[PDB]
């Protein structure tokens, strides 16, 4: 059955866009990640590096 949508309808009946994102658990090589960090480089003093 078709929705009836009009700009004068109630807020409860107003349209709403819902996006559900689902990520599967770890069972394969990981291909989606995010940015981690970046930092300027220094020299001639012993520091911790990654």
């Amino acid at each position: 059955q078709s929705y009836g949508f009009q700009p004068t309808y109630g807020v409860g009946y107003q349209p709403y866009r819902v996006v559900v994102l689902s990520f599967e658990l770890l069972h394969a090589p990981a291909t989606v990640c995010g940015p981690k960090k970046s930092t300027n480089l220094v020299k001639n003093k012993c520091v911790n590096f990654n």
């Binding site: 990520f23 770890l26 990981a30 989606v32 995010g34």
Partner: protein, 49 residues
């Protein structure tokens, strides 16, 4: 803006790329934003298939 109906909900598969979640939880255009299982911030420190 063109979205499918609830009965004909479309599926978009995203993989093999870098995901930027910082825009998602820092945008005021979303009235409802809730994550089940994992905290939204820590999602920027994990990887999935």
């Amino acid at each position: 803006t063109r979205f499918a109906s609830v009965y004909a909900w479309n599926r978009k598969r995203i993989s093999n790329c870098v995901a930027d979640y910082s825009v998602l939880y820092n945008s005021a255009s979303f009235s409802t934003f809730k994550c089940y299982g994992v905290s939204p911030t820590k999602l920027n420190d994990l990887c999935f298939t």
